[PDB]
Design a protein around this motif. Structure first.
Motif, mmCIF file in Angstrom:
data_model
loop_
_atom_site.group_PDB
_atom_site.id
_atom_site.type_symbol
_atom_site.label_atom_id
_atom_site.label_comp_id
_atom_site.label_asym_id
_atom_site.label_seq_id
_atom_site.Cartn_x
_atom_site.Cartn_y
_atom_site.Cartn_z
ATOM 1 N N UNK B 43 45.727 31.411 43.938
ATOM 2 C CA UNK B 43 44.436 31.846 44.441
ATOM 3 C C UNK B 43 43.437 32.178 43.332
ATOM 4 N N UNK B 44 42.157 32.080 43.667
ATOM 5 C CA UNK B 44 41.097 32.547 42.786
ATOM 6 C C UNK B 44 39.996 33.212 43.590
ATOM 7 N N UNK B 45 39.368 34.231 42.986
ATOM 8 C CA UNK B 45 38.297 34.952 43.664
ATOM 9 C C UNK B 45 37.079 35.032 42.762
ATOM 10 N N UNK B 59 37.037 33.130 48.121
ATOM 11 C CA UNK B 59 38.456 32.988 47.847
ATOM 12 C C UNK B 59 38.788 31.518 47.982
ATOM 13 N N UNK B 60 39.449 30.960 46.968
ATOM 14 C CA UNK B 60 40.021 29.624 47.097
ATOM 15 C C UNK B 60 41.528 29.691 46.846
ATOM 16 N N UNK B 61 42.255 28.757 47.454
ATOM 17 C CA UNK B 61 43.651 28.528 47.119
ATOM 18 C C UNK B 61 43.782 27.094 46.626
ATOM 19 N N UNK B 62 44.445 26.931 45.486
ATOM 20 C CA UNK B 62 44.666 25.640 44.863
ATOM 21 C C UNK B 62 46.151 25.315 44.886
ATOM 22 N N UNK B 63 46.457 24.033 45.030
ATOM 23 C CA UNK B 63 47.828 23.580 44.877
ATOM 24 C C UNK B 63 48.241 23.681 43.414
ATOM 25 N N UNK B 64 49.528 23.874 43.185
ATOM 26 C CA UNK B 64 50.046 23.861 41.827
ATOM 27 C C UNK B 64 51.170 22.859 41.792
ATOM 28 N N UNK B 65 51.198 22.012 40.767
ATOM 29 C CA UNK B 65 50.373 21.981 39.554
ATOM 30 C C UNK B 65 49.069 21.160 39.622
ATOM 31 N N UNK B 66 48.770 20.536 40.762
ATOM 32 C CA UNK B 66 47.651 19.598 40.837
ATOM 33 C C UNK B 66 46.284 20.272 40.763
ATOM 34 N N UNK B 67 46.191 21.545 41.140
ATOM 35 C CA UNK B 67 44.945 22.299 41.072
ATOM 36 C C UNK B 67 43.877 21.717 42.000
ATOM 37 N N UNK B 68 44.286 21.312 43.198
ATOM 38 C CA UNK B 68 43.368 20.845 44.229
ATOM 39 C C UNK B 68 43.128 21.947 45.253
ATOM 40 N N UNK B 69 41.878 22.060 45.709
ATOM 41 C CA UNK B 69 41.498 23.100 46.658
ATOM 42 C C UNK B 69 42.115 22.778 48.015
ATOM 43 N N UNK B 71 42.329 25.589 50.368
ATOM 44 C CA UNK B 71 41.697 26.565 51.246
ATOM 45 C C UNK B 71 40.476 27.124 50.540
ATOM 46 N N UNK B 72 39.414 27.375 51.301
ATOM 47 C CA UNK B 72 38.197 27.940 50.739
ATOM 48 C C UNK B 72 37.523 28.811 51.788
ATOM 49 N N UNK B 73 36.919 29.912 51.347
ATOM 50 C CA UNK B 73 36.192 30.817 52.232
ATOM 51 C C UNK B 73 35.151 31.557 51.402
ATOM 52 N N UNK B 74 33.893 31.512 51.841
ATOM 53 C CA UNK B 74 32.789 32.207 51.189
ATOM 54 C C UNK B 74 32.106 33.087 52.222
ATOM 55 N N UNK B 75 31.929 34.361 51.889
ATOM 56 C CA UNK B 75 31.408 35.350 52.826
ATOM 57 C C UNK B 75 30.263 36.093 52.164
ATOM 58 N N UNK B 95 35.897 43.836 49.788
ATOM 59 C CA UNK B 95 35.500 42.512 50.248
ATOM 60 C C UNK B 95 36.504 41.445 49.836
ATOM 61 N N UNK B 96 37.111 41.595 48.665
ATOM 62 C CA UNK B 96 38.185 40.691 48.290
ATOM 63 C C UNK B 96 39.376 40.851 49.229
ATOM 64 N N UNK B 97 39.751 42.095 49.532
ATOM 65 C CA UNK B 97 40.823 42.356 50.492
ATOM 66 C C UNK B 97 40.498 41.720 51.841
ATOM 67 N N UNK B 98 39.243 41.845 52.291
ATOM 68 C CA UNK B 98 38.856 41.248 53.567
ATOM 69 C C UNK B 98 38.974 39.722 53.535
ATOM 70 N N UNK B 99 38.686 39.092 52.392
ATOM 71 C CA UNK B 99 38.918 37.654 52.282
ATOM 72 C C UNK B 99 40.394 37.318 52.469
#
Lengths: 250, 242
Positions: B43-45, B59-69, B71-75, B95-99
């Protein structure tokens, strides 16, 4: 309709006006400082810019600066928010912005006539143009000021092409001041590619606007370069963008 | 502007309480694996604040090791706490917790196995930066990634520090940040071959420093680790969509 492309009906009239005004372009030096080996006598160099607001197809900010030569310090500045009437159409750039530049020069004349620039650097081509009459010539002929066209991208006209051969010539430019000529299919020299400083690699494309020769236009542009973009144009653009930022409440 | 001292004093008290919950060693099997085998989701925030009080947390979630997005959410978020160095969590961690809670409710199978945060973890005035704070409130493993050196416990971006940076020559090279206390607060990391400005990596929660640094390096296509970079791209893009 300010963002709408003009009808062909309108574009034909603009071509007509470009042909009319082109007869008045002077493509040789007419100023004593231009024949001086060190441009001795040159004291004031103008630069212009028009920045178009990113969401508005209706708002733009036009700026004029005058810099001392050779020190390149700003001695006059003016920015104005203006209302646009026409979109960008390649080959017709003057028709969306040259009236604003003319009014800036008239405001300078009314306010600080002793700071009238001896030559103006213009963000756009001069004779390197679909019809040999780009915005730098257009401004030159309407104000009778000497003008230099300084373009940041190559206008692909009269056989000029940003192809592999062109990119090789750019690689051959090794230091600030190095140049290679822009040659039309006619063999006529339309302008020069200029490496503007030692730590840039993308050249400027310099052409005659009015009342100046190409070799003098190139040399002077080089001498005005602290960075890639010549300081008169660079300072005008900085002020236009700053004014827009302030206007947009920030 | 700056909050009153009574408020900062309460916040310091809260940081001290929560700090007891930080785990500064590896607790996940993939963390002790020579290749991080088992790691599938990183994940990254990011929280971008327009300087009105409008801001966007992503908040994004990337696959590992490919580093492809994956999941994404912007609030758009609306609180008005100012930036105070040492108290970053108090302007953004809820707000990070809420994401994270929104991810759990929407795509619980994409919950990240570790979160990279823009801000320090234990490299902090009181050993409890936003990366630890996020870690303790969600119990996710968290890594603190900072772009500038927090000058705490005797750390200083002086000439000596700048000489050590010059010695960083390749992606993956590191040097430890050693406080006047003798504590190792984090690592300076040259995150890729074509960047000279290092990242400052520290433990957030449920990870060791050596694993945090190695994983951060693996997440770097450019200087900024890809999970953070993709969250930041999305926050700014979301704002530009005014």
């Amino acid at each position: 309709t300010a963002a709408e492309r003009p009808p062909e009906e309108t574009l034909s009239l603009w071509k007509g006006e470009q042909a009319r005004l082109k007869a008045r372009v002077v493509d040789r030096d007419t100023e004593a400082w231009q024949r001086d080996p060190s441009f001795s006598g040159l004291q004031k160099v103008g630069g212009v810019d028009v920045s178009f607001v990113k969401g508005d197809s209706v708002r733009a900010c036009a700026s004029l600066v005058v810099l001392s030569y050779p020190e390149l310090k700003v001695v006059y500045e003016d920015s104005r928010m203006v209302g646009l009437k026409a979109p960008y159409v390649s080959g017709f750039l003057a028709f969306r912005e040259v009236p604003f530049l003319v009014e800036l020069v008239q405001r300078l004349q009314e306010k600080e006539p002793d700071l009238m620039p001896q030559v103006v650097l213009v963000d756009g081509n001069g004779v390197l143009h679909q019809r040999g009459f780009g915005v730098a010539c257009h401004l030159g002929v309407l104000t009778e000021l000497p003008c230099i066209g300084v373009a940041k991208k190559l206008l692909q006209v009269d056989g000029l092409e940003n192809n592999a051969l062109h990119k090789e010539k750019i690689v051959l430019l090794q230091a600030g001041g190095d140049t290679f000529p822009l040659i039309g299919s006619s063999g006529t020299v339309l302008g020069m590619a200029l490496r503007s400083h030692d730590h840039s690699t993308k050249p400027l494309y310099v052409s005659v606007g009015h009342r100046i020769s190409l070799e003098v236009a190139v040399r002077l542009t080089h001498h005005c370069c602290r960075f890639r973009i010549p300081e008169p144009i660079r300072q005008a653009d900085i002020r236009s963008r700053e004014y827009i930022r302030r206007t947009l409440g920030q």
